[PDB]
Each structure stands twice: as structure tokens, then as C-alpha cells.
Amino acid sequence: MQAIKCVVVGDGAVGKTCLLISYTTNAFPGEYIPTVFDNYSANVGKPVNLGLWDTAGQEDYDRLRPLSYPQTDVSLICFSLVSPASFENVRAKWYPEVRHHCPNTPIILVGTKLDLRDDKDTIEKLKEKKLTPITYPQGLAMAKEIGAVKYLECSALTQRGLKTVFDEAIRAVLCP
Amino acid sequence: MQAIKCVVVGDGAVGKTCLLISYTTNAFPGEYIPTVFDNYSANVMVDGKPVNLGLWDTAGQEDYDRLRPLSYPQTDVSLICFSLVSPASFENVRAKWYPEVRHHCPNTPIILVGTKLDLRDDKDTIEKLKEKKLTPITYPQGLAMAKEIGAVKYLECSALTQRGLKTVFDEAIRAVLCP
Amino acid sequence: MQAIKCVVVGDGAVGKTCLLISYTTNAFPGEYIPTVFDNYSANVMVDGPVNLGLWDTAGQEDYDRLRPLSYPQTDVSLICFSLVSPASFENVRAKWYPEVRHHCPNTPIILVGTKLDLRDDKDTIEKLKEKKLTPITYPQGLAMAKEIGAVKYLECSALTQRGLKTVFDEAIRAVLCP
Ligand SMILES: Nc1nc2c(ncn2[C@@H]2O[C@H](COP(=O)(O)OP(=O)(O)O)[C@@H](O)[C@H]2O)c(=O)[nH]1
Ligand SMILES: Nc1nc2c(ncn2[C@@H]2O[C@H](COP(=O)(O)OP(=O)(O)O)[C@@H](O)[C@H]2O)c(=O)[nH]1
Ligand SMILES: Nc1nc2c(ncn2[C@@H]2O[C@H](COP(=O)(O)OP(=O)(O)O)[C@@H](O)[C@H]2O)c(=O)[nH]1
Ligand SMILES: [Zn+2]
Ligand SMILES: [Zn+2]
Ligand SMILES: [Zn+2]
Ligand SMILES: [Zn+2]
Ligand SMILES: [Zn+2]
Ligand SMILES: [Zn+2]
Ligand SMILES: [Zn+2]
Numbered sequence A: 001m002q003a004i005k006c007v008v009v010g011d012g013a014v015g016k017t018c019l020l021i022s023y024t025t026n027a028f029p030g031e032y033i034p035t036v037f038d039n040y041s042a043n044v045g046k047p048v049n050l051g052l053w054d055t056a057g058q059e060d061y062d063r064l065r066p067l068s069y070p071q072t073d074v075s076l077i078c079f080s081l082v083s084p085a086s087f088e089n090v091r092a093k094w095y096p097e098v099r100h101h102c103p104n105t106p107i108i109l110v111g112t113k114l115d116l117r118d119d120k121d122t123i124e125k126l127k128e129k130k131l132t133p134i135t136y137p138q139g140l141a142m143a144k145e146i147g148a149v150k151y152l153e154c155s156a157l158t159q160r161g162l163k164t165v166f167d168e169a170i171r172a173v174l175c176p
Numbered sequence B: 001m002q003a004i005k006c007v008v009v010g011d012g013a014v015g016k017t018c019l020l021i022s023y024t025t026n027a028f029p030g031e032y033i034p035t036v037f038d039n040y041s042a043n044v045m046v047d048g049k050p051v052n053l054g055l056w057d058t059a060g061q062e063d064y065d066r067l068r069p070l071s072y073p074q075t076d077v078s079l080i081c082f083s084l085v086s087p088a089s090f091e092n093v094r095a096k097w098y099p100e101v102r103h104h105c106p107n108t109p110i111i112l113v114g115t116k117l118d119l120r121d122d123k124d125t126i127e128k129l130k131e132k133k134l135t136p137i138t139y140p141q142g143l144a145m146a147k148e149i150g151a152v153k154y155l156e157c158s159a160l161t162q163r164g165l166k167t168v169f170d171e172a173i174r175a176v177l178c179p
Numbered sequence C: 001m002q003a004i005k006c007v008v009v010g011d012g013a014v015g016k017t018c019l020l021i022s023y024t025t026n027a028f029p030g031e032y033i034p035t036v037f038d039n040y041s042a043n044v045m046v047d048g049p050v051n052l053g054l055w056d057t058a059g060q061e062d063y064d065r066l067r068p069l070s071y072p073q074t075d076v077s078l079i080c081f082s083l084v085s086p087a088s089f090e091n092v093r094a095k096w097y098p099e100v101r102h103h104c105p106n107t108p109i110i111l112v113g114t115k116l117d118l119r120d121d122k123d124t125i126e127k128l129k130e131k132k133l134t135p136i137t138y139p140q141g142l143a144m145a146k147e148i149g150a151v152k153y154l155e156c157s158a159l160t161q162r163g164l165k166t167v168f169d170e171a172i173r174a175v176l177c178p
């Protein structure tokens, strides 16, 4: 059994909690959603226990220090594919955070809310603000920029790509 | 979108946790009840614009709670809860909970919430209270206590049957958005 | 109504969280299990009213910022070990009994053997034999309970719901009827 600690980081409202709830319980939350999902684990794969940690705000101001204690093995940096602000924060904030608190450990870059990237209403609302969803090549390029071992897109709502995210988190630690 | 932090305070066993679980999940708990419901939030639309309503349950007195839920981060509105069928919980609104909110959340609105409305005018809860020379708290008494502590509203509800529950949280938002 | 604080302690992976989930919800968890079930209580009638508060734990008390064994005061503790992990059984004497004695002196202990469903699962017994191990027997468990001064020894399975209700019934009785 190899234990692994996987922490999910990123801006508020990108879908970190929903990612974890959908994957761990196969249910998508209702309108009231936990702010921070509790720590869960599974024994999966080869012999592996995958420990999953949700986060609140920036590590430095979180009394629980989920990114630092105990030691993190792999980080999922999440941004919403329909929030360009949240993508820019990968570079401004989240890659710096993981490098600072978890130096020399693998990062997976995860674009969330894949289902909304072709949602008519979502695209229109963005267009009204002179914005457009983040594309696959853009995400891939950000992943290369920050030294992420994988770029993955998913929807917690439809579960498209969701299983691959957590399989790759494990592979990043087991098969570096 | 304005974020609103709403904290639920009051004596043990008044129904704070059940108030939150019933509202957020539309189910009333079974035999085993969490002591303190985790933090949940919702994106709500109120007369035009998006609000995120964050709900916090509490354990005991703030000063001895290492989590300090009433203080961190800053609370926008407090629900002081007492059970309509526990006069002692009601007296503690004046002895404990109003002083607590005034101390830790100065100059923020209070809603006074009478819980367990489904028991107030009965099951023969009335007869069991009478054995002890006690009587359920009446609406006028609750209203008077709300005035005394400067609460912006007094509301009665049942988590069990959901009587009046949605109004509690609608009014909590309105107290912050419409001071 | 008497409030009772019951804390569940023992090695990682013995089945503490599952014990608590299965009992309180009558169903065994999926592949994804909370590391530490949140604090729950129930109002229960035993003989002539009790509130039984249940606390799950993580690692050793002294390094757990939450200090569940110490704060507030514990009335009874369940020391758990897996019937198919001899190492976890040895840690009853090396670790868990000393922990409860240090942080909760002069309070009752119930010793609980978990994963009773495996004590005869061939995949498990054979794999144990390969490592020169054998599942813990009832007499061994009983002897350890005597050694550590536990007021009861109980065996259970969260997976099948064998013996679960008895664990919590006896937890109550240990405080109510000392
Ligand atoms: N359409 C869609 N909405 C999502 C998805 N994941 C999260 N959301 C919504 O995005 C908002 C924030 O989700 P949450 O998981 O609480 O984000 P967090 O702050 O990063 O934890 C909520 O309104 C969710 O319902 C998704 O995959 N698809
Ligand atoms: N009849 C009735 N009982 C309730 C109601 N809400 C809570 N309770 C019960 O009151 C007890 C305490 O509830 P809880 O929510 O845990 O109280 P807290 O300590 O204030 O969180 C439990 O036995 C609940 O079942 C209600 O609306 N009606
Ligand atoms: N076969 C069997 N497995 C169990 C039982 N209880 C827990 N487990 C498994 O043992 C592992 C650890 O359980 P958990 O409750 O998380 O252990 P804890 O670390 O002590 O809380 C998980 O793989 C569970 O599915 C049981 O009664 N029987
Ligand atoms: Zn969240
Ligand atoms: Zn930092
Ligand atoms: Zn438009
Ligand atoms: Zn509660
Ligand atoms: Zn929790
Ligand atoms: Zn105070
Ligand atoms: Zn556990």
C-alpha cells in the first residue's frame, strides 16, 4: 500500500468541492454546497490509498494549512474553463502557491466545468463581457508553462473526464 | 454578488443543526444528528442580484470555541435560536446570546428565531411542561424579547415540518441587503 | 438526560470510521470513506434518557490539533483493532491502552475487534499465513481486554453489521452502570 495525499487548489467557485463530491459520491450537489468537502480516501489500482483534500482560500491564511500538513504528494490546480480570471490566477497565484508550499512535487492542471464551454447562455454572457472560454490548447500551454505533468479537462456535473483526473493524480506519484 | 455570513446561535438542543439540515437539504435528520453541521453556501437571487449566503452552525459559547465561528470571518447577520418549548432556552436569549452577539458581532443585525413550532401548541408537550409548572413561549413573548434585544425580526419555525423555515433565511438576507 | 462522550481510538485502517458510519446509518461506506467521521449524537432510552456523543479519531492524540480524546472530557473509549491485523492488536498494549490511561485516566474502556467477517476470509487467512501471521482469536481478544482492564470485549463487522449495536449499547452501560 502506498498512501498518497492529493490536494485540490484554485480560485473560489471553480468547482473544487463539486469535483470531489461528484467523484467520491457520484452525486452532484444541490443549491447548498459544502464550502470545503471533508478529507476522504479510497484503497484503489495497484495497492494505493488515495487521500483527497479540498481547500478554502489561500494556504497562508487558512488555519488548517491543508496544502502543508501533512506533506502533499500531488496537487490539482483547478480553474474554470468559463472563467478567464480563474485561469490567469493559475499563473499569478496557484502555481506560486504549490511551488512555495509543496516544492518538487507533481502538479496536474485541471480545467473544470467542461459542460459549460459549449453552453449557449454561458458563451453569450462571456461574449457580452468581451470574453471567451479557455480552449484546450490554451490550457495545455499553461500546463507546460507551470511544469504540470498533465493537463486534463472535466465536468463534475456530467462526470466527463472526471475518473481520468484522479487516475492521473495517482500515476503522477506512482509512475513519476 | 455580495457574500453574506449568517451564523446560528443558541442553547444546546434548541434545533440549530436541524434548522440548517432541513433548510439546506430538505430532509430532517434521523436518530443520529451532527453536533455541528459543516459550512454550506448557496448562490441566491434576491430582488435582482446574486448573493452568496453562507451558513454557519455553532457549538457552545464563542469564547471557549477554538473554531471561533461567530468571529472569523466577520459575521453579517446572526440567528439567535431558542426552543418554543424550552423556557430556559428563551431566558438565555437575554442572559447569554444577545450579550454574545453584541460582544462578538457589534452593529450587525439579529433575527430572533423560535424553533420547534410543531410542538408549541402541541403534541401533549404542553401537558409534560405543565407537570413542571412551565408553559410554551407565546408569539407575543417572543416578539417582546426581540424588541428587548433590538432584533430586526422575530420568526417562528419548525425544522421538522418546515413551517416558516424559508422565511427565516429570506429575512436573514434581507436584513443585510436592506438594512 | 445524561450526556455521554464516547471516543473511538485505534490504528489507522482498523475500521473506526466504518464502525461509526455503519452503526449510525445502518449501511457500509463505498470505496470513498471519510478519514474522520464528524461528531454525531443520538438521544436514546436505556432502561428507564441518554445522549450518546460519538467521536472518531485520526492519529495519536498528542499530535492531533483537535485533541478529541482530551477535550471535552471522555466518559468511555472504544479501543479498536482489526481481527486480521496482529500488528494493530499488539498496538492495543503498546499504544492505545497507554493513550487512554494517560489522557483519560479512571474511565472505562471497551476493547473492540473489528472486521469479524474476515477472520475466516480465505484470501485474508492465506495472505496472513504467507507472512507467518494468523487472525486474532476470541480468547486472545478476551485476554487482552483483561490485561488492559477493559470492562467488555466485543467483536463486530461493519461490513455485514454483525455485533454493531452491542458495541454502542455496552458503551452506554459502562458509564450508566459502572
Ligand atoms: N455546470 C457546472 N457547474 C459546476 C460544476 N462544478 C461546479 N459547478 C458550480 O460552480 C459553483 C461552485 O462550485 P464549488 O464546487 O462550490 O466551487 P469551489 O468554490 O471551487 O469549491 C456552484 O454553483 C456549482 O454548482 C460543473 O462541472 N458544471
Ligand atoms: N419536534 C421537533 N424537534 C426538533 C426540531 N428541530 C430539532 N429537533 C430535535 O431537538 C433535538 C436537538 O436538535 P439539534 O438540531 O441537534 O439541536 P442543537 O443542539 O441546537 O443543534 C433533537 O432531538 C432534534 O430531533 C423541530 O423542528 N421539531
Ligand atoms: N472487510 C471489512 N473491511 C472493513 C470493515 N470496516 C472497515 N473496513 C475496510 O477497512 C479500511 C479502513 O476502514 P476505515 O473505517 O476507514 O478505518 P479507520 O482508518 O480505522 O477509520 C477500508 O478499506 C474499509 O472498507 C469491516 O467490517 N470488514
Ligand atoms: Zn469549495
Ligand atoms: Zn502561500
Ligand atoms: Zn447578450
Ligand atoms: Zn447542533
Ligand atoms: Zn465535516
Ligand atoms: Zn463571548
Ligand atoms: Zn477513519
Ligand SMILES: [Zn+2]
Residues within 6 Å of the ligand: C061, C062, C099, C102, C103
Ligand atoms: Zn498521548
